Design a protein around this ligand. Structure first.
Ligand SMILES: Cc1cc2nc3c(=O)[nH]c(=O)nc-3n(C[C@H](O)[C@H](O)[C@H](O)CO)c2cc1C
Ligand SMILES: Cc1cc2nc3c(=O)[nH]c(=O)nc-3n(C[C@H](O)[C@H](O)[C@H](O)CO)c2cc1C
Ligand SMILES: Cc1cc2nc3c(=O)[nH]c(=O)nc-3n(C[C@H](O)[C@H](O)[C@H](O)CO)c2cc1C
Ligand SMILES: Cc1cc2nc3c(=O)[nH]c(=O)nc-3n(C[C@H](O)[C@H](O)[C@H](O)CO)c2cc1C
Ligand SMILES: Cc1cc2nc3c(=O)[nH]c(=O)nc-3n(C[C@H](O)[C@H](O)[C@H](O)CO)c2cc1C
Ligand SMILES: Cc1cc2nc3c(=O)[nH]c(=O)nc-3n(C[C@H](O)[C@H](O)[C@H](O)CO)c2cc1C
Ligand SMILES: Cc1cc2nc3c(=O)[nH]c(=O)nc-3n(C[C@H](O)[C@H](O)[C@H](O)CO)c2cc1C
Ligand SMILES: Cc1cc2nc3c(=O)[nH]c(=O)nc-3n(C[C@H](O)[C@H](O)[C@H](O)CO)c2cc1C
Ligand SMILES: Cc1cc2nc3c(=O)[nH]c(=O)nc-3n(C[C@H](O)[C@H](O)[C@H](O)CO)c2cc1C
Ligand SMILES: Cc1cc2nc3c(=O)[nH]c(=O)nc-3n(C[C@H](O)[C@H](O)[C@H](O)CO)c2cc1C
Ligand SMILES: Cc1cc2nc3c(=O)[nH]c(=O)nc-3n(C[C@H](O)[C@H](O)[C@H](O)CO)c2cc1C
Ligand SMILES: Cc1cc2nc3c(=O)[nH]c(=O)nc-3n(C[C@H](O)[C@H](O)[C@H](O)CO)c2cc1C
Ligand SMILES: [Cl-]
Ligand SMILES: [Cl-]
Ligand SMILES: [Cl-]
Ligand SMILES: [Cl-]
Ligand SMILES: [Mg+2]
Ligand SMILES: [Mg+2]
Ligand SMILES: [Mg+2]
Ligand SMILES: [Mg+2]
Ligand SMILES: [Mg+2]
Ligand SMILES: [Mg+2]
Ligand SMILES: [Mg+2]
Ligand SMILES: [Mg+2]
Ligand SMILES: [Mg+2]
Ligand SMILES: [Mg+2]
Ligand SMILES: [Mg+2]
Ligand SMILES: [Mg+2]
Ligand SMILES: [Mg+2]
Ligand SMILES: [Mg+2]
Ligand SMILES: [Mg+2]
Ligand SMILES: [Mg+2]
Ligand SMILES: [Mg+2]
Ligand SMILES: [Mg+2]
Ligand SMILES: [Mg+2]
Ligand SMILES: [Mg+2]
Ligand SMILES: [Mg+2]
Ligand SMILES: [Mg+2]
Ligand SMILES: [Mg+2]
Ligand SMILES: [Mg+2]
Ligand code: NA
Ligand code: NA
Ligand code: NA
Ligand code: NA
Lengths: 64, 64, 64, 64, 64, 64, 64, 64, 64, 64, 64, 64
């Protein structure tokens, strides 16, 4: 059985690095992370000093 | 990193109050709740005594 | 077996009351109405004297 | 010919009042506003003192 | 309030049995599981000895 | 001209048998049923004694 | 209250004439037909002597 | 950089002529119109003397 | 078994004729073409001397 | 690099067997078939003697 | 009230730089740009000397 | 007439380089490749030694 958690990673550099930021977080607390699906991408502009790229992913991990 | 949980709130009064019911629940157990996105709305009729409005939201919270 | 009919209710007050307007109509002529799913919402402005909220629902009812 | 502008209204009270907030703004600067279609709804929580309901609409107006 | 978890069940027999595999898992660790919605189906071919049917479901459970 | 009716069939056995349950019902009361399109599938768990598979179909029939 | 019926019109000439074929049928049996929304278009090739254009519409009519 | 404006053209003749009606309007006031994408089509019936075909397009134009 | 190929036809006259242009091409090289589904429509303006209507179709054909 | 082909399998028994019918066909002529994604399901009723279940899949295979 | 404009940025380097190209343009002529949502990405190949990455964004800005 | 093939490119570096990997492959065997549309992006984690970015594109090419 796989389960997915819906995480948004951020990066001041690129959409790929923002996807890695969410995946790194999932791998800090979950075992058996096996793939991630990008579901949304965007850029935060008016709440930050530098534009921040955001990449939202479903991160799938195999249970037990 | 943000994470989202997918909750359906209910209200006998309105779709806005059913969204607040899910958000209130998220805020009882999570810290740093920052926004919610409505993904579905509906009305339960044939299992209740009063119509019950349901509003399903992804509730986003900032991790650590 | 459930069947659904696709109805748009209207209200000069709110999207929740426009959903109830469609459901009230379904319950006037159908038996065993059991739930409704909101599929669209909008506001009529330039054909009315007061803005009219419209909420389109699939209204499900159990057959026999 | 109709044209649409994509506006997000806000309200501390309800999703219906947030739709009216966008429509009121369109009617301040455009003539012949004729209908609005709701395309998204959400709630801002972690950047405000009171939850703020947001309702995003395409607001259609007839040209000339 | 309902919450949903996004699980993918697997079966070497059918898409219905792969949906039951995810639901069985949810029922091992959650109380008050009340319904599941199928969101995706697929077949793993080139990483297994027998084709494996996969059925991804949102499994809803009532909170407290 | 074809018309479609939106029916949800149920089965305690499989998603295919739940699609046949809706189609059987359409064929009891309509003539010239010609095809059905699956639009949604789900499983009722917390209102029944046995899980019930549900398959929602648009059932098309040729008019006159 | 508006209700919609889901009809597919056909024409050997064009997608516009196939939409009119469904609307003509709705107007033969319903009163107060007020608008139609195109939801799908296609062409039947291998079951006919001439290609047949098909245009599927939700045809809305005002109730009473 | 391209920008798009969302326009609905109308015609009493066909969906193609209603798309041209929106594009003609865009070309009256914008320079460098380069392509249009159809996003919706429908037919106004109960507010007109003749059916009016409507074709909604995103009309893209190159900026400067 | 059916297979589909994804083709975009073009016409300087109409969206129906652009769908026929893709279907004519499929029928020049494939046997047993049985139906086509329209998936997208658009108009090329800024790369041509006359507007060119484009209609993208999945063209289905029965295998062997 | 993976490529996908869009095939519809058929079965008089079930949606799972109709998915296997498309996959079996892909495996007769392609090497390195690695997974399939279900994209649509339906039932042919009015052109056959027995209902025929149809399951449309994108069948992915690794190139070289 | 927020308004969004739909812009496509281009870059010969990456999808992230093409998103920044649209955002830079919006910030040259609008005040209070606050976030952008990616809605589409693609690559122009056969009209250019170098591949050009294109990233289409809704760029939101707060009104007054 | 344009035709599209559905390819998934991979890269250990970025989503842009994974899109180029699919396009490079299409250009090795097809003539007149003219544009590609991104339809999906994801990251393979649990079957590789380094994360692999995957970008799925419809690659369009002009026929003859
Ligand atoms: C992708 C993205 C989306 C956002 N959407 C909203 C929104 O709807 N409302 C708001 O107040 N702020 C928003 N902020 C947003 C920030 C980002 C990066
Ligand atoms: C929105 C809504 C959706 C529902 N959908 C179903 C369904 O598919 N099947 C069922 O037995 N009950 C259902 N009950 C539903 C109740 C509500 C409120
Ligand atoms: C939601 C909504 C949508 C509408 N869409 C259209 C349309 O496409 N064309 C038209 O003439 N009038 C329209 N009127 C509309 C009125 C409402 C309330
Ligand atoms: C609906 C809604 C959506 C939002 N989405 C985002 C987002 O993606 N990222 C962010 O930093 N803030 C966001 N803020 C958001 C605020 C609201 C109200
Ligand atoms: C449904 C399904 C989808 C898959 N999608 C991918 C994919 O995008 N990339 C990959 O390396 N493997 C994949 N493997 C997949 C396996 C299954 C069963
Ligand atoms: C598919 C499925 C969906 C349902 N959705 C809901 C829902 O939204 N709310 C509710 O009270 N019960 C629901 N019951 C549902 C039952 C089934 C089988
Ligand atoms: C639009 C269109 C769609 C069709 N889809 C199918 C299908 O899935 N299966 C089948 O046997 N025949 C089909 N016939 C079709 C005919 C037309 C015109
Ligand atoms: C496409 C089309 C859509 C429309 N939708 C609506 C609607 O939702 N409500 C209404 O009062 N009138 C409507 N009028 C409509 C007119 C057209 C042509
Ligand atoms: C429908 C249509 C879509 C197009 N989309 C694009 C695009 O994204 N970028 C571009 O450079 N040219 C484009 N050209 C387009 C031409 C047509 C006809
Ligand atoms: C799924 C399915 C879809 C179909 N759709 C159509 C259609 O649009 N028009 C038609 O003449 N026959 C059709 N036949 C169809 C047959 C099947 C099985
Ligand atoms: C994303 C993208 C999409 C395009 N779509 C089309 C199209 O439909 N037709 C055309 O003539 N050119 C097109 N050109 C396109 C160029 C790009 C970059
Ligand atoms: C995007 C992506 C999607 C995938 N989806 C699946 C899946 O559904 N099932 C599976 O066994 N492996 C999968 N593997 C996947 C690998 C990637 C990269
Ligand atoms: Cl989710
Ligand atoms: Cl419907
Ligand atoms: Cl838009
Ligand atoms: Cl495809
Ligand atoms: Mg930096
Ligand atoms: Mg988002
Ligand atoms: Mg009360
Ligand atoms: Mg729901
Ligand atoms: Mg009042
Ligand atoms: Mg509507
Ligand atoms: Mg207040
Ligand atoms: Mg939004
Ligand atoms: Mg076995
Ligand atoms: Mg999946
Ligand atoms: Mg049994
Ligand atoms: Mg459903
Ligand atoms: Mg003729
Ligand atoms: Mg169809
Ligand atoms: Mg005339
Ligand atoms: Mg519309
Ligand atoms: Mg000519
Ligand atoms: Mg297209
Ligand atoms: Mg048999
Ligand atoms: Mg289909
Ligand atoms: Mg360079
Ligand atoms: Mg695009
Ligand atoms: Mg490296
Ligand atoms: Mg994919
Ligand atoms: Na989730
Ligand atoms: Na219907
Ligand atoms: Na717009
Ligand atoms: Na394809």
């Amino acid at each position: 059985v796989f389960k997915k958690v819906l995480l948004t990673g951020t990066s001041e550099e690129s959409f790929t690095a923002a996807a890695d930021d969410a995946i790194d977080r999932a791998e800090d607390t979950l075992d058996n992370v096996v793939w991630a699906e990008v579901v949304d991408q965007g850029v935060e502009i008016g709440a930050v000093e530098e534009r921040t790229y955001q990449t939202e992913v479903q991160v799938a991990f195999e249970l037990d």
